[PDB]
Design a protein around this ligand. Structure first.
Ligand SMILES: *Cn1cc(CCCc2cn(C*)nn2)nn1
Lengths: 8, 160
């Protein structure tokens, strides 16, 4: 399950 | 094409948080365009994931689609919750985002916020009826995804 676009 | 380069620059501006460039380039064609070479994200997905509050606010006021799904079924609210961006999550909910939306794996925004341990986002989602007992396709509820070490969030999701 790959992450959506963004960053913490 | 004219539209394709402009779409690209708009997606880039949304990721970068450059609201003046976003305003310059936002058209009916571009506002909900998809990032065809990536994961089919819209400008709003990018603005949400990268914590670009002013851009989110601009996009929401100019017709951006809060319900748009990326190739994995993620909506912008999922990106906000998985990356821990509270103001964005709040804005999206205030503009009609459905807190119980599920991606292709049946993960909801609360599964994401619970795993990340973000108190204020978990509270926002719970106050708008997010279900802490909903199983994803691993059989895990959002309460199950709370890190075992994270007692404060466990308590919050238990509710009652
Ligand atoms: C699914 N997924 C990917 C990531 C991190 C991707 C790289 C990154 C982005 N930002 C701000 N910091 N690191 N998390 N979840």
């Amino acid at each position: 399950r790959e992450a959506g676009d963004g960053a913490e | 094409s004219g539209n394709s380069e402009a779409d690209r620059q708009l997606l880039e501006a949304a990721k970068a948080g450059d609201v003046e460039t976003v305003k310059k380039l936002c058209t009916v064609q571009s506002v909900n365009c998809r990032d065809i070479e990536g994961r089919q994200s819209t400008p709003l997905h990018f603005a949400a994931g990268y914590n670009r509050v002013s851009v989110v606010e601009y996009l929401l006021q100019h017709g951006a689609d809060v319900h748009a799904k990326d190739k994995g079924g993620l909506v912008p609210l999922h990106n906000a919750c998985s990356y821990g961006h509270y103001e964005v999550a709040e804005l999206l909910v205030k503009h009609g985002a459905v807190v119980n939306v599920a991606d292709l794996w049946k993960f909801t925004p609360l599964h994401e916020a619970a795993a990340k341990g973000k108190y204020e986002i978990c509270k926002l989602l719970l106050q708008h009826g997010a279900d802490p007992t909903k199983k994803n396709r691993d059989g895990n509820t959002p309460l199950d995804l709370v890190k075992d070490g994270d007692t404060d969030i466990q308590d919050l999701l238990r509710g009652d």
